[PDB]
Design a binder for this molecule. Structure first.
Ligand SMILES: Nc1nc(NC2CC2)cc(N2CCOCC2)n1
Length: 154
């Protein structure tokens, strides 16, 4: 059994947009925009809503780029994160009570201030390859196991 989450990376030819999470789960780390998928909305719908909520941005089209399953030791539910990509954004990103958005050059991505798994799968995101990932965490900092592969269908 797993719970659905979304994650949205606005990835342009020279830069990626990230947000500093100000409260809640993952506070103090840069990440893409996303969160819990709600009852009554598609996964992509949930992805658009969290992007609008956390950055004010809306998007013409979202593209499926990956799926990452997380297990946390001692927690019965798995985290199933659907990762989306997009180039063209509508609007200017602005701080919310969840996220302080900033653009990053692609050689200055702050992996040390991100979730530790991102160092593993973000490269596949940059090569525009679809991927499936699995990470077993102890706490929120320690990866104990992981698998990562390229897929033809996310
Ligand atoms: N890039 C990334 N790495 C994560 N690592 C797992 C917590 C250990 C979680 C996560 N998000 C989870 C919540 O919804 C947004 C995506 N995003």
């Amino acid at each position: 059994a797993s719970r659905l989450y979304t994650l949205v990376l606005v990835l342009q030819p020279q830069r990626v947009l990230l947000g500093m999470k100000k409260r809640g789960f993952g506070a103090g780390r840069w990440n893409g925009f996303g969160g819990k998928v709600q009852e009554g909305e598609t996964i992509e719908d949930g992805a658009r809503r969290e992007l609008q909520e956390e950055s004010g941005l809306t998007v013409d089209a979202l593209h499926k780029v990956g799926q990452i399953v997380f297990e946390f030791v001692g927690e019965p539910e798995l985290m199933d994160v659907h990762v989306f990509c997009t180039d063209s954004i509508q609007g200017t990103p602005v701080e919310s009570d969840e996220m302080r958005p900033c653009w990053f050059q692609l050689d200055q991505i702050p992996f040390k201030d991100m979730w530790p798994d991102d160092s593993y799968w973000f490269p596949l995101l940059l090569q525009k390859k679809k991927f499936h990932g699995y990470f077993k965490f102890q706490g929120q900092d320690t990866i104990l196991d992981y698998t990562l592969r390229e897929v033809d269908t996310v």
